[PDB]
Scaffold this motif. Structure first.
Motif, PDB file in Angstrom:
ATOM      1  N   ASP A 130       0.853  -1.175   0.000  1.00 22.43           N
ATOM      2  CA  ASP A 130       0.000   0.000   0.000  1.00 22.43           C
ATOM      3  C   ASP A 130       0.892   1.229   0.000  1.00 22.43           C
ATOM      4  OD1 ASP A 130      -3.008   0.706   0.281  1.00 22.43           O
ATOM      5  OD2 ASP A 130      -2.040   2.018   1.747  1.00 22.43           O
ATOM      6  N   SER A 131       0.276   2.379  -0.242  1.00 22.25           N
ATOM      7  CA  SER A 131       0.945   3.668  -0.243  1.00 22.25           C
ATOM      8  C   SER A 131       0.363   4.527   0.864  1.00 22.25           C
ATOM      9  CB  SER A 131       0.776   4.362  -1.584  1.00 22.25           C
ATOM     10  OG  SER A 131      -0.571   4.731  -1.788  1.00 22.25           O
ATOM     11  N   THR A 132       1.238   5.134   1.650  1.00 19.59           N
ATOM     12  CA  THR A 132       0.823   6.085   2.660  1.00 19.59           C
ATOM     13  C   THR A 132       0.549   7.436   2.010  1.00 19.59           C
ATOM     14  OG1 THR A 132       1.390   6.935   4.850  1.00 19.59           O
ATOM     15  CG2 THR A 132       3.079   7.007   3.140  1.00 19.59           C
ATOM     16  N   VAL A 150      -1.137   0.497  -8.083  1.00 17.61           N
ATOM     17  CA  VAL A 150      -0.815   1.876  -7.755  1.00 17.61           C
ATOM     18  C   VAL A 150       0.474   1.948  -6.957  1.00 17.61           C
ATOM     19  CG1 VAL A 150      -1.626   3.881  -6.493  1.00 17.61           C
ATOM     20  CG2 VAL A 150      -3.179   2.595  -7.893  1.00 17.61           C
ATOM     21  N   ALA A 151       0.688   0.989  -6.061  1.00 20.89           N
ATOM     22  CA  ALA A 151       1.887   1.011  -5.237  1.00 20.89           C
ATOM     23  C   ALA A 151       3.127   0.852  -6.097  1.00 20.89           C
ATOM     24  CB  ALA A 151       1.822  -0.094  -4.196  1.00 20.89           C
ATOM     25  N   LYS A 152       3.097  -0.121  -7.007  1.00 19.84           N
ATOM     26  CA  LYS A 152       4.217  -0.342  -7.909  1.00 19.84           C
ATOM     27  C   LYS A 152       4.491   0.880  -8.770  1.00 19.84           C
ATOM     28  CE  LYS A 152       5.773  -3.649 -11.395  1.00 19.84           C
ATOM     29  NZ  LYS A 152       7.039  -4.097 -10.780  1.00 19.84           N
ATOM     30  N   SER A 153       3.460   1.673  -9.061  1.00 17.61           N
ATOM     31  CA  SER A 153       3.661   2.894  -9.828  1.00 17.61           C
ATOM     32  C   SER A 153       4.543   3.867  -9.060  1.00 17.61           C
ATOM     33  CB  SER A 153       2.312   3.534 -10.157  1.00 17.61           C
ATOM     34  OG  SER A 153       2.468   4.699 -10.950  1.00 17.61           O
ATOM     35  N   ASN A 154       4.058   4.335  -7.917  1.00 19.51           N
ATOM     36  CA  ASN A 154       4.831   5.199  -7.028  1.00 19.51           C
ATOM     37  C   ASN A 154       5.515   4.368  -5.944  1.00 19.51           C
ATOM     38  OD1 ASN A 154       2.621   4.543  -5.479  1.00 19.51           O
ATOM     39  ND2 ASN A 154       1.908   6.648  -5.217  1.00 19.51           N
ATOM     40  N   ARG A 155       6.349   3.452  -6.416  1.00 19.98           N
ATOM     41  CA  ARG A 155       7.127   2.582  -5.547  1.00 19.98           C
ATOM     42  C   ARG A 155       8.470   3.204  -5.211  1.00 19.98           C
ATOM     43  NH1 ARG A 155       7.478  -3.731  -7.071  1.00 19.98           N
ATOM     44  NH2 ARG A 155       5.308  -3.529  -6.389  1.00 19.98           N
TER      45      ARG A 155
END
Lengths: 191, 141, 141, 104, 19, 53, 56, 137, 75, 65
Positions: free
Chosen positions: A111-113, A186-191
RNA sequence: GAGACUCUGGCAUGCUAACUAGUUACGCGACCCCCGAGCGGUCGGCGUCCCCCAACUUCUUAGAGGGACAAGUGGCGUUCAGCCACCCGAGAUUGAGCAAUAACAGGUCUGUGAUGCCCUUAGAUGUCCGGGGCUGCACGCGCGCUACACUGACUGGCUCAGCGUGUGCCUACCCUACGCCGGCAGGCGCGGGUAACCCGUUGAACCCCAUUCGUGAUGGGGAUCGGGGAUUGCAAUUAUUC
């Protein structure tokens, strides 16, 4: 009965919760089982006491939602009891395995914070704990059948079972999975 | 046996069918122009409802004697939908409550008694308890 | 040679009492059996200590239960409680305590509200809101 | 037993009220045969709420006044000579004694 | 009293007296 | 002349009044208290009323 | 042990003012202030206006 | 059974022959749920069925009751126009006449220039409502 | 958008499809029969009542909300 | 969620030891009783808290001034 | 000032005692009469039978005293102050109430026979009577009620609470059992209650078990409008409630 605990009919044994991480948080295979959903339910005072709650009781709690139905455990037990029975026909197998399989393969791994860098919105991938995997799984499954059965001729029992079977296996056409893969995307995008 | 040893959604059904069969009630004429309560919206779906009402009443009389019309009226009171304004409580109907009792009083299962009320007769309980027996001993209840 | 003992199984506002003695093995509640009280969905939850000890121990015991107050569900969980406390106290007084330890362990292992009560009671409203913690809405403008 | 009298006590200061009971049952257990024990009735509670302000404006706050009332009763088996004697025993504080002559 | 009034209304008026 | 007090008061809120303040708005009719609200709060203690909660 | 006096009104001017004169120890909050204080409030009338007195 | 469902007509008003009888007949303006059920009891027609049980013998039995409910023993606290202001007799106005009664009742008030007639005319509430906030157009 | 026209009663074609191959299922519920075949649902319920009476299917549990039937369990 | 003792509690615990060190020991429920017997506190709960600090304090007095 | 303090809640088979809060075991002292079973014992019962010489423990009855204090334990700590996990048990605790110095041109002269200063005072801003209006509608703002349906609506049957109030008021008036008549607006007769003695075991709803309906702005939803009935009062039109 002093050696087995059913829900009246089917048993908590003969099932193997198959992981290490998702151990220690699911009360189904334990010999500390119960014949029925809700007891009193003291399991909300402390922080990590909610881990020692039977998984079906957790599920039962989450269903009654959206205001038209609060404080209707007994209604939800009817749904659950009818729901596990309909599982039994379609595959002739303990629904408990079908339940844990979903909970297992429905918890997002990444997940992304919302670290908006003090007001400049740009996130950052992070990892997820076991207990939150378990919770978002149940929440996603419950808000599956619901929106599917809202204005339809199917009832919650059928729609619950349909999404539940399709999430135990990888069906790629269930609400749970279509969202889980999205979040990982989405996480892998802005990883 | 006692009526307190069976499923009591079904005891009522047996009693009404028995009571219909003998049939000495003089049911009122107005069995199709009524609603059974102010707070209702329709008359019943079932065409023969008078007979069940007697069964429920006398059944209630067995458990709790010394209960008159207004008391029976309160029993069958229910929820009232006033539309846009909130719900409330509403009582039953004096008319059918009274006239149902009088038919049973005619039928000799109940006698108007001292200090107000209707206690079911000292000879109505045979029918009221044997019928439980057939119900419970015809098959497994 | 009587063996009276009475015990209470309190809940939120309920009060469920059981009078126990030797008799001929009966588990009655309020003039009705253990099977036909109130919703049959939770019938299993009453039969927990039944199944959990069996029937061999309840052989030489008749009890009568009476209960008052509360609601449907609380009135159950009290009866679930009054039974066991009545049972364990009977043994401590008319059996060796080696017996009561044998059986108290199983109960506490399955669940802990079988014996000890739950102290939660409903709390009080405050001016400003419809309830204790909530408050009415605020425009800011 | 001869006459069957009954005595009632209503007041607010509990300590004053529980005192006079002890006083009277002492004299009754002193010179009598057998009387009663104090039958404690449930208290009443008068409750009032108001707006804590005289005007309308302000913030919407409330106040809640009350007063409790404590009540007891006892009876005796004896001739009425005794009640005319022992109704005079220094019942000073606010305490209403109300007494019947025979069972009323 | 003469009018056989409740104990509630009694104590109240007993206070209104003193005021 | 006879038409002076012709109105049949007999009821309503223009019939009663605070016994002490001789007012008409915001009265209390409980236990014959029949008193204006501000006036009640003012004294409220010789009567025996107090507040604990 | 202690006392407190307060006075308010039109005092040497057209604008309203207030005065507080104290000595000794005094308590304000709690619930022994229902039997360890003897309050009194009063109203003095004069040609200019009114003055409030308080004393404890 | 009786699979000749027969979409039909009554009093120039089409009935959908798919609904139960207690609720299909309600299409007619002047008939409701009460009036529907009670007449169907006086007509002895079973209500389990759809509009398949509407052979001509059955309907006209219902229709004669429609225009004349009174001598079929239906009490007088049940009809619409009870003790009419002119021609003061109990009767029930049905479709296409109910509009006429509604119309003429209004012009009655208008020509007579009563308070209600003006407000119907002006297009406003008449049962003592408010208008500061509601009824905006 | 799911705006469809259904059937009050049978039409001899559903009957061809219901007297057979409906008992050739694992699960039986009326909502599913409306899904497969275009009917209202009162008929979904009523037909299965008959179909149990005629003895081709099997019952599991009935409730005022959900009712469940089964294959005849070829054995 | 915290539990600190105030000056009234502490100072009296000091004075009690400095008079009656022989009456007291290492048991709370005896130390409870003697404090009641010698001193006249207005409250049961204040009685409790004083003694609990007294007993904590004796264990320090055993070794180390 | 905070804390301490007061009230309430949570525990006691230990004390105290009970028809005006009031039972529960025994005798059934009676249940009625078969009140059912059954060819019997045994089970069944909520109120109906009392004086009150058959117990009070467990409701609410209510007084006293008791109990919890970071006290015992393992770590952490300037090894002080104290903090975290635990053993028995209620382990900081629902909670509120009270509330300091100095202040705001905050509000209230429409709460007061609390009051200054200005205005008026017999053709009155006084005080009575008749009627009307404070509710008027091209629009904007806020506190809320109902619903947008199948986890549902309708129709019948089962089953459980608690805080309360109640008749003669300082200038005018109760909560209701039982019967008889009609759907309610009801309406006539008698009874109870100055009150947990009567209403009253406050037979409440949502819930629960079974029939009807089947995605259809549909039986969801109930605004609007017509007509008829009754009730409060001296008086219901701008419909006062039902």
């Amino acid at each position: 009965t002093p050696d087995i605990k059913l829900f009246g009919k089917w048993s908590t044994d003969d099932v193997q919760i198959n992981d290490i991480s998702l151990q220690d948080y699911i009360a189904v295979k334990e010999k500390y089982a119960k014949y029925l959903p809700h007891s009193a339910g003291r399991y909300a005072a402390k922080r990590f006491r909610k881990a020692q709650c039977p998984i079906v009781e957790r599920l039962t709690n989450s269903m009654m939602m959206h205001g038209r139905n609060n404080g209707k455990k007994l209604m939800t037990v009817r749904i659950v009891k009818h729901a596990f029975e309909i599982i039994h026909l379609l595959t002739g197998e303990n629904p408990l395995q079908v339940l844990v399989n979903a909970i297992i393969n429905s918890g997002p791994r990444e997940d992304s914070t919302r670290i908006g860098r003090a007001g400049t919105v740009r996130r950052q991938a992070v990892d997820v704990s076991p207990l939150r995997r378990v919770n978002q799984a149940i929440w996603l499954l419950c808000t599956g059948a619901r929106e599917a059965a809202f204005r339809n001729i199917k009832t919650i029992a059928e729609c619950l079972a349909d999404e539940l079977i399709n999430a135990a296996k990888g069906s790629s056409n269930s609400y749970a999975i279509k969202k889980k893969d999205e979040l990982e995307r989405v996480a892998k995008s802005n990883r | 046996v006692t009526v307190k040893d069976v499923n009591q959604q079904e005891f009522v059904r047996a009693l009404a069918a028995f009571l219909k069969k003998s049939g000495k009630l003089k049911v009122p004429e107005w069995v199709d122009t009524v609603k059974l309560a102010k707070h209702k919206e329709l008359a019943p779906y079932d065409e023969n409802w008078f007979y069940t009402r007697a069964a429920s009443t006398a059944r209630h009389l067995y458990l709790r004697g010394g209960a008159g019309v207004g008391s029976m009226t309160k029993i069958y009171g229910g929820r009232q939908r006033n539309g846009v304004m909130p719900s409330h409580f509403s009582r039953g109907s004096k008319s059918v409550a009274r006239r149902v009792l009088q038919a049973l009083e005619g039928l000799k299962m109940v006698e108007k008694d001292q200090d107000g009320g209707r206690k079911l007769t000292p000879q109505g309980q045979r029918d009221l308890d044997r019928i439980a027996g057939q119900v419970a001993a015809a098959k497994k209840k | 040679p009587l063996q009276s003992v009475q015990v209470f199984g309190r809940k939120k506002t309920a009060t469920a009492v059981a009078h126990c003695k030797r008799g001929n093995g009966l588990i009655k509640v309020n003039g009705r059996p253990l099977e036909m009280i109130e919703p049959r969905t939770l019938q299993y939850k009453l039969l927990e200590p039944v199944l959990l000890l069996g029937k061999e121990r309840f052989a030489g015991v008749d009890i009568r239960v009476r209960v008052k107050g509360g609601g449907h569900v609380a009135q159950i969980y009290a009866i679930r409680q009054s039974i066991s406390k009545a049972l364990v106290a009977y043994y401590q007084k008319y059996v060796d305590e080696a017996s009561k330890k044998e059986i108290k362990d199983i109960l506490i292992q399955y669940d802990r509200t079988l014996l000890v009560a739950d102290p939660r009671r409903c709390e009080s409203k405050k001016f400003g809101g419809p309830g204790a913690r909530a408050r009415y809405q605020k425009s800011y403008r | 037993a001869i006459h069957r009298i009954r005595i009632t006590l209503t007041s607010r200061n509990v300590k004053s009220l529980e005192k006079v009971c002890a006083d009277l049952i002492r004299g009754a257990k002193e010179k009598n045969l057998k009387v009663k024990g104090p039958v404690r009735m449930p208290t009443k509670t008068l409750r009032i709420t108001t707006r804590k302000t005289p005007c309308g404006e302000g913030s919407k706050t409330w106040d809640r006044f009350q007063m409790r009332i404590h009540k007891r009763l006892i009876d005796l088996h004896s001739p009425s000579e005794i009640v005319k004697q022992i109704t005079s025993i220094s019942i000073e504080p606010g305490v209403e004694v109300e007494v019947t002559i025979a069972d009323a | 009293m003469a009018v056989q009034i409740s104990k509630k209304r009694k104590f109240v008026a007993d206070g209104i007296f003193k005021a | 002349q006879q038409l002076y007090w012709s109105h049949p008061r007999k009821f309503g809120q223009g019939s009663r009044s605070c016994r002490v303040c001789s007012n008409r708005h915001g009265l209390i009719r409980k236990y014959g208290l029949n008193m204006c609200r501000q006036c009640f709060r003012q004294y409220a203690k010789d009567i025996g009323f107090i507040k604990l909660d | 042990k202690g006392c407190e006096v307060v006075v308010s009104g039109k005092l040497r001017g057209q604008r309203a003012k207030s005065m507080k004169f104290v000595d000794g120890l005094m308590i304000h909050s709690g619930d022994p202030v229902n039997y360890y204080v003897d309050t009194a409030v009063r109203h003095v009338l004069l040609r200019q206006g009114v003055l409030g007195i308080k004393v404890k | 059974p009786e699979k000749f469902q027969h979409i039909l007509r009554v009093l120039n008003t089409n009935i959908d022959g798919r609904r139960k009888i207690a609720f299909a007949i309600t299409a007619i303006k002047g008939v409701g749920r009460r009036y529907a059920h009670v007449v169907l009891r006086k007509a002895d027609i079973d209500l389990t069925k759809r509009a398949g049980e509407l052979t001509e013998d059955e309907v006209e039995r219902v229709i004669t009751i429609m225009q004349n409910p009174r001598q079929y023993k239906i009490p007088d606290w049940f009809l619409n126009r009870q003790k009419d202001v002119k021609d003061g007799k109990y009767s029930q106005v049905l479709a296409n006449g109910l509009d006429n009664k509604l119309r003429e009742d209004l012009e009655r008030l208008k020509k007579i220039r009563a308070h209600r007639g003006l407000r119907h005319f002006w297009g406003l509430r008449v049962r003592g409502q408010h208008t500061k906030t509601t009824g905006r157009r | 958008r799911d705006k469809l026209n259904n059937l009050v009663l049978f039409d001899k074609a559903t009957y061809d499809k219901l007297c057979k191959e409906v008992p050739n299922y694992k699960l039986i519920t009326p909502a599913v029969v409306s899904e497969r075949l275009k009917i209202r649902g009162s008929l979904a319920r009523a037909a299965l009542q008959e179909l149990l009476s005629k003895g081709l299917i099997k019952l599991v549990s009935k409730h005022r909300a959900q009712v469940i039937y089964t294959r005849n369990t070829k054995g | 969620m915290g539990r600190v003792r105030t000056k009234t509690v502490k100072k009296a615990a000091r004075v009690i030891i400095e008079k009656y060190y022989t009456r007291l020991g290492n048991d709370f429920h005896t130390n409870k009783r003697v404090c009641e017997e010698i001193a006249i506190i207005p409250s049961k709960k204040l009685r409790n808290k004083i003694a609990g600090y007294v007993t904590h304090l004796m264990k320090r007095i055993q070794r180390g001034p």
